[PDB]
Symmetry: D2
Subunit: 302 residues, 4 copies
């Protein structure tokens, strides 16, 4: 109430205890996928949306249509989950909310996960997801690509992939707490680490090794904050101040700016990693951030 988030303090402590448990006892991947799906799949979608599954040519996900939306405009969202877990199902509750806020159709897309499918399996999928969307008759200018953490990793990598293949860029990209350096470098590990109850250096190290499967962390397609960002589209990045991954957002911003790009960065005080995904626990900062992102997505698509 009244401009403060009454839930963040409580949610942070829940995260502290939760992290202490996962640090002491590193659980099954297949097990954490189910429990992730179970928790998140149980969160009600945005009101008033039609959801249609997609399953054609190994391209898989869901079209989310807010009934108020402009159906000529598309958000392509890739869930996060360290490239280990997450799905369309789990992120439906967030992507639907972002769609309804932006007044656009969302493509809530799946992609192959590590350890079973290391780099470049995910990224090939993301490119195929993007081709799928273009093939529905959306022009590049009618697309924002997005994702949080690992999905943020894919979203940013896709743009680099499109540049390499000399292909036109979407209208923009929305990155939420994106993970853009799979070598875990930045002032924020040390500086924000005591304030980050959710994400540890150790966790990312492990997610990174499984994803790369010996591929170098220095590869820009793996670590987008190591790329030259010349000719990428407009960017909106949301990150929390209380995040080891803070530095990746600021660095990508630096590079985007240096490449001459329109780039907006909002670092939210007191916010933990991908806090909008946690709107069910954090309705004040989480919904307000979904509205901020929604408004940029909407402005960006014209």
């Amino acid at each position: 109430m009244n401009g403060n988030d009454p839930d963040i303090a409580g949610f942070k402590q829940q995260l502290v205890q939760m992290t202490a448990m996962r640090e002491s006892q590193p659980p099954s991947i297949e097990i954490e996928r189910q429990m992730f799906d179970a928790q998140h799949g149980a969160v009600p979608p945005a009101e008033g949306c039609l959801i249609e599954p997609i399953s054609t040519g190994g391209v898989r996900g869901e079209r989310i249509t807010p009934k108020s939306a402009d159906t000529s405009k598309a958000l392509i969202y890739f869930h996060g989950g360290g490239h280990l877990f997450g799905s369309a199902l789990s992120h439906r509750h967030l992507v639907s909310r972002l769609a309804a806020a932006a007044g656009v159709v969302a493509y809530n897309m799946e992609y192959r996960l590590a350890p079973e499918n290391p780099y470049p399996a995910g990224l090939d999928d993301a490119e195929q997801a993007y081709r799928f969307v273009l093939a529905q008759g959306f022009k590049p200018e009618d697309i924002i690509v997005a994702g949080e953490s690992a999905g943020g990793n894919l979203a940013a990598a896709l743009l680099l992939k499109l540049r390499d293949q000399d292909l036109p860029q979407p209208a923009g990209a929305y990155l939420l707490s994106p993970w853009l350096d799979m070598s875990q470098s930045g002032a924020s590990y040390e500086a924000r680490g005591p304030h980050d109850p959710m994400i540890t250096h150790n966790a990312l190290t492990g997610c990174s090794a499984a994803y790369r499967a010996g591929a170098s962390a220095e590869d820009p397609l793996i670590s987008p904050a190591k790329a030259d960002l010349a000719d990428l589209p407009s960017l909106f990045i949301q990150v929390g101040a209380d995040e080891v991954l803070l530095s990746d957002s600021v660095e990508f911003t630096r590079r985007a700016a240096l490449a001459g790009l329109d780039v907006r960065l909002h670092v939210w005080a007191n916010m933990v990693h991908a806090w909008p995904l946690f709107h069910f626990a954090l309705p004040v900062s989480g919904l307000a951030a979904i509205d901020e992102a929604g408004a940029w997505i909407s402005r960006q698509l014209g």
Copy 2:
């Protein structure tokens, strides 16, 4: 989608058949209260709100606090229901959404119903409800008073009661499809009646008899569209174009204007009676109207 309401056509047909059933077979009061509670009580409240019951000094209802709201500002809402049915429980889903959109606390207040408690029992309750809120340490200029149909009836009569008792007015009133003439007069019965699938002349005639219990329809406290509106506060009125009650809204507007009041009237094309209460069936027009109303209530207490 795309500016259009894809559900109103279908919802109107459901209402036609519904009305045809209730016209042919006039059901029990006690039965229709339960069925009304059951359907509307099942609609999820606005996300992220805290709801506390109220039951002291014959004042009964619910405080709804949106977690983002300003706790020093208050909406007092009276459900409609022809003064025969409806409750806090039934209207929770609407009043919560209105509160969340307005960024204010809602008092979702009960009042005694006809035929058991004819006029002036409900209005005595509404005044009690108003005093109760003031007693929580809200000043008059921190209150919007509100309600749809019969609730709109009470809201608007409350203002008249406050004027009679030479009391400060709230900062405004929000009226949704208010029923302001309990004699069922107006061009709209004939002009809009073939387009109104939900509200008949005959149903209101009946609801009016039960509420009045022999009291005159001419009495301004029963029929606010028969009052002189000198010194009332700012008004926002939403009403649908496809409503027998349309003329009551336009007349109250006329009178408000003639008394020199700030008055905003939005007649929504194609909209049926209290369509925002039906946001679960009408997500496009219903949520958009809740947002409109929310924006006004916020600007009004800003």
Copy 3:
């Protein structure tokens, strides 16, 4: 400051003295046209607009392009002035502001005036102005027509003219203090007359006789508040509470609503006739009203 208009009280007194002078001494028409042009033409246009004169086939006015505008969207504005005075030049300062607020191109159009050119000279011009605009490649759905007082008279008449000629309607019409009953009827003459410092029954009587030149006041094309408004487009009407012409706005609203139309009416407390035209004296209520109108024009054109 702080939600009150610090200029209205002063401006009202200036109007009282001004009206007392014009009542005692009815001046030259040709003289009042120059002095009207002189005062209003001296008001700076909205910042950042390109203005191009139009002079082709007796169609005359100005294209106002806000540099931020969407050039596929058009406002057609007809100045008021009792059908005796006013011009593109005089209303440029208002129409430019409305254009810039709405983000659309404005066609600020001239039309022949009484006494030299009584009805239907003006209205023939308004229709030709509208044809001119369509011929620039604007579709009907990309047009709002508008005007204040007498311009409000023309705007509303044009819509009736389009219906008669079985021609498609524009997307909407914006009417500011429109004068829609050239017989001077309504509760507001008596009820608002002591509060209206600018517009008198006598003035309108005189403007009406010159315009009609024996044509009947009962003709709907002369008095749009006497028409059946079936099949007109969406409406936004702004009027002040302190206006003898208040009743015309409320009646047109009533009729629009009764015909099933989307109609928005905002009656502003304390506001005098066409107060947005007086934004140079009334920057609080005048600019805020231009923003309200701008936002509706923008929403209406998609």
Copy 4:
């Protein structure tokens, strides 16, 4: 029009030739102050504002009151001008527009300039200015502190001075193209320098020498992008992508984030240095940025 800035291309060319002239022929300080005052003093202030001079206890400037503003909320703005030139008079046109957009009172404050008054004369003034405003009975959380380039330098140093003197911070700071590193370091000198038509490395080097008068560039109070930003308030920074000073904005952002601050950074594609100060040449991007900044300042003091 249509999303595009039709004037930036032309304005950039004017800046190229302007810079080429001043590079070849380095003009008088006293002369450039007059020419700067003459050009900018001629730009009309925001419509509807009251401006009062201030000259007491060595504090000098202007109170700008937008007639619609909230008089309990205040923006303190320091003009830029390389700490060599600029004045209240020159920046009136921008600060008035910012105030009018934000709905707050502006303190448009002077400060002593180099070479006559080197560091710390300006900063002593800025602190004086701040105290003066507090003394008008504004609380810290009713103040945004602001300035562009050199003004941004002072604004951001003021916050550091307030921290040193263990004083309450204002509610936020708005920095436009701030000059935060007076050693002229950053990737952007090389990366953005061919795209910056307005600001050269050489000009800043000179402005830095005159301001420092032998003081070290390393001093945080001179170079805020060298400070630790612990406990500063919320930040909004606008900077253009085509600016040698881009890196200073990104670095201050980095530091703010690392100190845990709420920080919003908007890098505008194609925009030259302090482009909102050039709204008279750049109405599309300049007014849109004033509105963005205004919206933030309003939300911040809301």
